[PDB]
Design a protein around this ligand. Sequence first.
Ligand SMILES: CCOc1nc(N)c2nc(-c3cncc(F)c3)n(Cc3ccc(CN4C[C@@H]5C[C@H]4CN5C)cc3)c2n1
Ligand SMILES: CCOc1nc(N)c2nc(-c3cncc(F)c3)n(Cc3ccc(CN4C[C@@H]5C[C@H]4CN5C)cc3)c2n1
Ligand SMILES: *[C@@H]1O[C@H](CO)[C@@H](O[C@@H]2O[C@H](CO)[C@@H](O)[C@H](O)[C@H]2NC(C)=O)[C@H](O)[C@H]1NC(C)=O
Ligand SMILES: *[C@@H]1O[C@H](CO)[C@@H](O[C@@H]2O[C@H](CO)[C@@H](O)[C@H](O)[C@H]2NC(C)=O)[C@H](O)[C@H]1NC(C)=O
Ligand SMILES: *[C@@H]1O[C@H](CO)[C@@H](O)[C@H](O)[C@H]1NC(C)=O
Ligand SMILES: *[C@@H]1O[C@H](CO)[C@@H](O)[C@H](O)[C@H]1NC(C)=O
Ligand SMILES: *[C@@H]1O[C@H](CO)[C@@H](O)[C@H](O)[C@H]1NC(C)=O
Ligand SMILES: *[C@@H]1O[C@H](CO)[C@@H](O)[C@H](O)[C@H]1NC(C)=O
Ligand SMILES: *[C@@H]1O[C@H](CO)[C@@H](O)[C@H](O)[C@H]1NC(C)=O
Ligand SMILES: *[C@@H]1O[C@H](CO)[C@@H](O)[C@H](O)[C@H]1NC(C)=O
Ligand SMILES: *[C@@H]1O[C@H](CO)[C@@H](O)[C@H](O)[C@H]1NC(C)=O
Ligand SMILES: *[C@@H]1O[C@H](CO)[C@@H](O)[C@H](O)[C@H]1NC(C)=O
Ligand SMILES: *[C@@H]1O[C@H](CO)[C@@H](O)[C@H](O)[C@H]1NC(C)=O
Ligand SMILES: *[C@@H]1O[C@H](CO)[C@@H](O)[C@H](O)[C@H]1NC(C)=O
Ligand SMILES: *[C@@H]1O[C@H](CO)[C@@H](O)[C@H](O)[C@H]1NC(C)=O
Lengths: 772, 772
Amino acid sequence: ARWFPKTLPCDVTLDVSKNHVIVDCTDKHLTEIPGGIPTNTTNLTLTINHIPDISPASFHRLVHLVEIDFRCNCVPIRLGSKSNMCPRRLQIKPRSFSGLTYLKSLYLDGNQLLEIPQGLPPSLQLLSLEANNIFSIRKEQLTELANIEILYLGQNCYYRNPCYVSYSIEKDAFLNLTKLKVLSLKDNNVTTVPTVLPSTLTELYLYNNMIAEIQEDDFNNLNQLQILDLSGNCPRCYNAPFPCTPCKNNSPLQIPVNAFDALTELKVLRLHSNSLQHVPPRWFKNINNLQELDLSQNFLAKEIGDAKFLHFLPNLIQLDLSFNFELQVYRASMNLSQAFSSLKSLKILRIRGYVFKELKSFQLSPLHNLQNLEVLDLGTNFIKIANLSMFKQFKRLKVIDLSVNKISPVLEQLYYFRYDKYARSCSCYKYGQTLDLSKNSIFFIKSSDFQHLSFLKCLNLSGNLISQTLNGSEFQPLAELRYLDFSNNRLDLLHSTAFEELRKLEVLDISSNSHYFQSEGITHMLNFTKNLKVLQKLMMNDNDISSSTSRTMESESLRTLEFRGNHLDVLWRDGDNRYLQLFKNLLKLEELDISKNSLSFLPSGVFDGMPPNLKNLSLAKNGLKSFIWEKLRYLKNLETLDLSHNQLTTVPERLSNCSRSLKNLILKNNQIRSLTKYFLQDAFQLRYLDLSSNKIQMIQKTSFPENVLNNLKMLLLHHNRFLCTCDAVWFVWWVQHTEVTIPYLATDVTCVGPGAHKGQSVISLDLYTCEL
Amino acid sequence: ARWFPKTLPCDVTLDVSKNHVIVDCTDKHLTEIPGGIPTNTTNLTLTINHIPDISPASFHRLVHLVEIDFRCNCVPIRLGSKSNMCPRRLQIKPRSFSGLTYLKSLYLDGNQLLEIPQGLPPSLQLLSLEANNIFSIRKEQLTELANIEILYLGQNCYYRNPCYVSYSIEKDAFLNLTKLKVLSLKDNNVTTVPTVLPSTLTELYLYNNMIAEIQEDDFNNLNQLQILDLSGNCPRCYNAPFPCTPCKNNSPLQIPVNAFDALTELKVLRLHSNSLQHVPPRWFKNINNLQELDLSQNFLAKEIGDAKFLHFLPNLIQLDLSFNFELQVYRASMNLSQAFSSLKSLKILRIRGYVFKELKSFQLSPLHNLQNLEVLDLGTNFIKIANLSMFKQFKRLKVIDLSVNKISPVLEQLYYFRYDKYARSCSCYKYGQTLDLSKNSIFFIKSSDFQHLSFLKCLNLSGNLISQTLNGSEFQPLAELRYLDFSNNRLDLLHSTAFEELRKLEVLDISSNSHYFQSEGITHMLNFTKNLKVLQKLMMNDNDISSSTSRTMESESLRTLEFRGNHLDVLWRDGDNRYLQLFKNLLKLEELDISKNSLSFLPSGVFDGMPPNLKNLSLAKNGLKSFIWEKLRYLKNLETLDLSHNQLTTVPERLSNCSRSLKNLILKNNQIRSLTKYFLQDAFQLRYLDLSSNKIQMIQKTSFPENVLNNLKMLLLHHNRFLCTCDAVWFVWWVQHTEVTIPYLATDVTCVGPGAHKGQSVISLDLYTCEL
Ligand SMILES: CCOc1nc(N)c2nc(-c3cncc(F)c3)n(Cc3ccc(CN4C[C@@H]5C[C@H]4CN5C)cc3)c2n1
Ligand SMILES: CCOc1nc(N)c2nc(-c3cncc(F)c3)n(Cc3ccc(CN4C[C@@H]5C[C@H]4CN5C)cc3)c2n1
Ligand SMILES: *[C@@H]1O[C@H](CO)[C@@H](O[C@@H]2O[C@H](CO)[C@@H](O)[C@H](O)[C@H]2NC(C)=O)[C@H](O)[C@H]1NC(C)=O
Ligand SMILES: *[C@@H]1O[C@H](CO)[C@@H](O[C@@H]2O[C@H](CO)[C@@H](O)[C@H](O)[C@H]2NC(C)=O)[C@H](O)[C@H]1NC(C)=O
Ligand SMILES: *[C@@H]1O[C@H](CO)[C@@H](O)[C@H](O)[C@H]1NC(C)=O
Ligand SMILES: *[C@@H]1O[C@H](CO)[C@@H](O)[C@H](O)[C@H]1NC(C)=O
Ligand SMILES: *[C@@H]1O[C@H](CO)[C@@H](O)[C@H](O)[C@H]1NC(C)=O
Ligand SMILES: *[C@@H]1O[C@H](CO)[C@@H](O)[C@H](O)[C@H]1NC(C)=O
Ligand SMILES: *[C@@H]1O[C@H](CO)[C@@H](O)[C@H](O)[C@H]1NC(C)=O
Ligand SMILES: *[C@@H]1O[C@H](CO)[C@@H](O)[C@H](O)[C@H]1NC(C)=O
Ligand SMILES: *[C@@H]1O[C@H](CO)[C@@H](O)[C@H](O)[C@H]1NC(C)=O
Ligand SMILES: *[C@@H]1O[C@H](CO)[C@@H](O)[C@H](O)[C@H]1NC(C)=O
Ligand SMILES: *[C@@H]1O[C@H](CO)[C@@H](O)[C@H](O)[C@H]1NC(C)=O
Ligand SMILES: *[C@@H]1O[C@H](CO)[C@@H](O)[C@H](O)[C@H]1NC(C)=O
Ligand SMILES: *[C@@H]1O[C@H](CO)[C@@H](O)[C@H](O)[C@H]1NC(C)=O
């Protein structure tokens, strides 16, 4: 169907609309730029290869290049692979870029460049050189960047990439860059705010450096600036998960009361981890459009009880005061000043790590009339006592986050403590008001705990110590709850009435409640689903279920059931019939996940026991060694069948005879060593076939008739054991000229033999000697 | 060093003392008995193969045979492989066994035999036919077994192997078996005790059948009988994890009060799961040597409060009353009759599954002066309340097991519910007094909870809900405790004084306490070990540890540290120096397990940081892709290094030059494709080398100097990718003629090629074509 196979080990994409021809050679194990990149090419990406040099030959004919992404061909030793270290830094010849008169972006991050490449074209707007070894910026070396708008110079001198000296910036070095809009000098061992900066700046990033003092003429001319980040200068180093040296005498970063007076257009000010003990109100008189303020990881515990500066922040949308506890203090309560009530625009308020024992309703009084307050995040505070009913006054909020506390009767997992949360590399909220009580110490629950909280749409009890026999009496106020996360508890299904009070329950997660399922003789009423008339999705993963008092689960509403990580192999012990219909009366079940169930075989009758409308069935990761494909005829609405990561050695003789409906067949990571002679014959609804990571040596046209292959949206065959003899002539030819999508022709569709062709990719194979 | 290689795919062993030449071909995928079995063979095992028939040729010359183990060559389909089902039942030709004049044991279990094989020689003493299809026993078919003493006929008719009729035993079928001592007819659909049985019987197994009544004279002549098992006739079927049919009206097994009057010699009486509601004292009038009584899984709850039959059991050693609770009752307390006090020889009392809310001290008073009580087992009782100090009156006991209860302020896992716990296939007690509180609902602890338990040597709190900051005040009475299992809790190491109260603690398990290590910003004092001056072994597996407030763990006593399943990869982030000596001041550490720590490379300084007496180091299952072997010289006492299940591709050029001490090198399950030219040269300390499951094609003699091979206790080479060309001539000759121990030369030391030799064993390879 193609006259000319593409040998090029890169994805080539066309945007005729944006007149962009995108060549992506990310991570293709290249040691030189490939030959034959399309002449018209605009976007060329070579990230994560081992190309040792750039020279005028490199970009060649590619005079239409508007972006070169040549990152991480020589990553700093502590940041890159230690099994494939880069031996000598990237070498950039003179004259390598001067010819590309249209070049608008040059990414050279992570190549151990010692100096800024020069001879760059006047079209250049973005220059990225993060994670190199450039720690002296001289103004003459920036002449070439007259038109530059975004300059990334960070991470050239920090603990993961040390330069052992201070960062040096010549006076006024960036001033004649009259179009510079974003300047990043983060993670650089900078000692002073470089002056004078061009007034064009909208974004200035100076965080995680060694700046101890702000002079007040540092930001005199930054009247266009919108983002200022001074975080991590004089860091608060307690439990730092990276090497951290605070400023001497525990000094804060010193910012004169008026250093921000020119920042008329400042929208976000990040002063995270500056060891601040006060926030002088005078900082903020001339910014009255500030919307985002980060004051986390300082020493502002008492300042939180005062905070006169809040009165000057009426347009503030986000305010972060997390981790300001003073070391070794366990406050009894939270003293929030009334000044918080003047934060009329406030949508996001986060105060993690204040560390106090009791939260009572009055201490949140300053927030009672913040009419757009959407998120109150009080996590990681070791609160032991809280009347949950106090949150009736916050029916308005979208998320009340008490995660990680000690109560008893989405941000990254390393977020507040990560060194550079913005470092570049080479959930039930949608249902409505959410109260997150996850990772707490609630050992018992009763309906009263939730009085005056009827409005809740999603409730998170994940990771508590709830080990009680739910009989439908524990959650009665929560008449609108649609989502209950009950995972990582010890649910005791003694009563088939568990959870039935939640009459609008749509999603129930009782995954990882294996405690009681792991001990013999305990009763488990699995048919409790009969009572949740609205339930749509039930997750009971990793429960170790191997016995059930009830022989059938019943639901008229349930569409998806996650039953992964249990012991259906024991429930379906060969000879025991009693549970072969456990799922039959889930009448609108469309998706069943029973991967990870040790099902080395499926008893006869499992398929007949499946509910009538099943579309998507996962039997992955079961150690399946045999499979009676013919019993798929019982699965009359089956469209996706996932047999990945098993021990299957054969495919059916006639897939067409096993199902008239199957669309997506996933057979990756099995032991298949060859296909049956007429495998796919007349399988006209087959659309997706993953056979990757098997042991296939040959594929003849008998098994892959082209009138079924050619309607495949995708066809995965990488990581097999292909034998590229003259007997393979049709498969090699078909792989070379098909329009069907086959991922990884470059890196993993390969001959294992014979000898001559070993490790050679099938797409590059010349089999002319088979035709003499 | 051998002139004649052993090609036979079976382990051949010699016992010169007992004149046993044992040939073990268990599970060698045999389709016929291998050729060349030694003529002297006495013990031949062919279990789990696919040998389709036995005929006189089978053993033709093996006339010294004393035992043939020919089990599971045709397992019943519901019991056996579905991927390699047996197609046709085993066929035994006439006269196949009559020649083996010394045959004393014949195992033919699991071959779908239709009839008792005939022609057996009169030497035969043991005959096993479990899991066949022989369900009609006729007196004529047993004449041949005149000298028989042990007869296994069970599992020929039950739910995993159905015969669809009742078992038939001809009247007096076994009477003329004048030497029969063991008769087993378990799992057979037997309906009546077969009569008359020979009076030689010492053991009779009739369990899991359909016997509803014992006749008064069924055991009249069994005056030599020692073990009677009538369990599972009229089963109690509640929560049965197998198909279970009770007797009509849930009636008990009916046993006349005088049925045991001849069993003067009975030591073991098993009446498990017989739906008994009373135990008539009259049963035990003439049994005065009973030592073991199993009364579990009945309806004897009320009887436990009465139990006049105990007065007739002064020699009883074990009594099991487990799982006798009445359905739908949650008794408030346990009523044990005062008659328990007449059980003076009692060593083991098990009453699981009585189901009561409170255990108070007065209720165990019938046991206070049982002077040989060693084990009291009260697990799986849903006890909600128990004052632990009551066990001061049981200092004499070895194990107090309150496991799997609901207390708050070694047996099989399926044991009382297993169908046939004796079905045949084809820990801190040693420290002293043990109180097992594992799998309970103890969320908070304090010193008084253990008042008057100063004697305890081991405490199991595994799997409770303890989520508190231990500061060394919680265990203060436990002055003699040597072992604390604290696994599966939520340990909070805020204080480095945790556990210091346990001043004689030798083994501490805090594995699987990952909860608080999973949230950022929490303080974890890993140096709490300085305070335990006798601690020998610390397990902290699977805690997900990735951050630590203390930089060094300190101990003067610790020998073993299990640190598996954590995130040393994060702690030792490349560029972060601070934790590279975390184990350095554990001065007597001899064993470190830091497997499963995501260590894809080891930062420089890890080996230098290791404590000075480290002998045994596991870095298994880390995704290790590179390894600087030379740094092993920092481990001056290294003897065992485990690098198994990683991604290593090369071995060092000279292992001897990397370590002067290394004895055991485990490199299994890596990506090694070849050995260095002088790999093992002068490695005079090497004793054990595992190179199995790699990708090795060739091994030359330079790499395996024979003055090093001859000091190997073992050398594992199976499952590589050996290439049996003429270039392999030395390795094929050496494997065939060496005396070094190599497991699986028969089964998994195999050629992948070239062509002719694929799948062929190296030991069988004839390379004369390489010498013409
Ligand atoms: C024996 C194996 O079955 C099993 N399986 C479990 N999963 C389970 N859980 C608990 C449990 C215990 N205590 C606190 C909890 F939160 C849970 N129990 C004990 C129990 C036994 C019977 C009854 C029946 N009710 C008591 C009665 C009769 C009915 C109403 N009357 C007051 C209630 C509880 C369990 N027993
Ligand atoms: C977030 C910082 O790190 C961290 N790490 C943990 N692991 C942790 N655990 C708890 C905890 C709380 N309450 C119940 C529990 F069972 C555990 N807290 C809160 C806390 C913080 C400080 C102090 C120290 N105070 C100063 C003293 C001694 C004590 C009282 N005196 C005034 C005590 C408790 C924790 N805080
Ligand atoms: C940041 O700058 C400081 C000071 O310029 C560097 O510290 C010097 O490092 C060398 C080599 O370790 C020492 O001999 C000097 O005494 C250090 N000077 C001071 C003042 O400490 C430091 O290495 C730089 N940091 C990084 C990550 O490169
Ligand atoms: C044990 O014996 C009973 C009868 O003694 C067998 O039950 C018969 O099975 C056939 C086929 O399943 C039925 O058509 C009969 O109605 C059954 N008879 C009775 C009285 O139930 C039973 O199959 C045997 N059990 C096993 C495991 O083989
Ligand atoms: C291609 O490069 C241009 C110029 O840097 C950029 O604006 C555009 O978004 C890129 N498009 C793609 C698909 O990479
Ligand atoms: C509930 O909290 C847990 C634990 O923090 C989290 O993993 C999970 O995603 C939350 N549930 C939802 C539905 O977001
Ligand atoms: C269910 O059990 C709870 C205790 O968890 C109890 O308070 C309640 O009365 C019970 N509900 C019913 C309907 O029996
Ligand atoms: C579930 O099945 C059990 C049978 O053991 C029955 O007692 C109970 O009423 C059933 N409950 C529901 C909700 O179907
Ligand atoms: C060999 O067979 C005899 C006869 O049954 C048996 O007593 C002995 O234990 C067997 N020895 C071994 C090592 O299998
Ligand atoms: C438990 O009994 C002991 C006597 O051994 C007594 O000292 C203690 O007060 C009792 N504790 C409780 C909670 O009843
Ligand atoms: C403690 O109990 C648990 C669970 O019952 C068990 O796995 C563990 O082996 C026990 N600990 C010891 C030291 O035997
Ligand atoms: C240790 O903490 C416990 C609470 O777990 C408290 O009762 C006790 O007073 C504390 N003792 C010391 C010495 O800090
Ligand atoms: C553990 O190390 C910490 C370091 O912060 C120290 O404060 C504490 O006293 C140490 N504890 C012990 C028992 O050595
Ligand atoms: C080394 O340690 C492992 C446990 O991690 C143990 O299985 C093995 O026997 C030890 N080897 C020696 C020689 O002590
Ligand atoms: C390794 O070999 C070199 C060269 O013989 C030698 O100088 C060095 O001492 C050796 N190291 C060890 C630890 O044997």
